[PDB]
Amino acid sequence: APSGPFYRVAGMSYLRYSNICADLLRNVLKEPFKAKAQARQAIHFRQAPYVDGKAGASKVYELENGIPKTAN
């Protein structure tokens, strides 16, 4: 239903696609450099929508191995 590259027609944004390809390069690095690249791979934050002004509802992340390869 979108028209474009293989990530864009699959609903995926370019930022997710380019970070998946960034993730899979890090899993192939040398071990003196693989674990320090695991530092810049981790994702730790949280989000919360504000539909009314003060309400709640969120989505927390304690991800280590990288951005999720599966469907969001």
Place this chain on the structure above:
Amino acid sequence: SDKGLCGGLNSNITKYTRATLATTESEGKDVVVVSIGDKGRSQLTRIESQRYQLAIADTYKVRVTFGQASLIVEELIKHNPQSYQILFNKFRSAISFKPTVATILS
């Protein structure tokens, strides 16, 4: 920020928020106000609570990574605006922090 012994840093850019959020509205447009950092939801509601729709916090707890900043950006493209406004303090030296507006057009 997330923790708040900063000394009026989280308020100076909340002040610089409405300084640019009243400036760039010349036609009555939609604006979604987002805050990254837990000290932003407590101060942006004081000015715009009807346009405040997203709250990212717990960002700086381990570190800041590009994959994390990608996911924050993908949640910002769920809404699709025609422009983006990023309001932050540019770390120039240990003394001066001149704030920046960085704009991204769709």
Place this chain on the structure above:
Amino acid sequence: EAAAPAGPKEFTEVWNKKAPSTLIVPEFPSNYTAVKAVGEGQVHGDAFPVNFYTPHSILSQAQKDTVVLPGVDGYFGVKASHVPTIAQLKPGVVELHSGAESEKFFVSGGFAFVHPNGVTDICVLEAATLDQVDPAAVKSALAAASAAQPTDEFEQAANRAAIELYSALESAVEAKA
């Protein structure tokens, strides 16, 4: 087609009409870069400025004589007064030559712009040199990525990105000098 004469200099003059007069103007990212695109110069004959970046590192900002960029059509090379280019890059090897000596970074994909003043601005995410890649576990996950293709259409792209990355990574460890 020119409804909004915007810019950094215009934003200063109008923001003094809506904000308080106490506040000075916010800064802009144009005030921190001195190198422009249409500004004439910045080639200097043989060696042209190459700004090879990542989010987490500035891997090069001095001048080179040729850059082999892994574009999605194929590997192309940039000389000094190259045509202006916005090139989306595949997972491949960026080769930075200075002369007889060349450094070979394997990148994950991400664009590369050649600006009209001859400035090359490579913009990738993960740019590993091949010295710190091992050729063992690349096919250990490529064989797994050659097997696991379900009807997940989101993993249709993510496995496709998994296959084409390691496959270019297979072919670019073999021909090293």
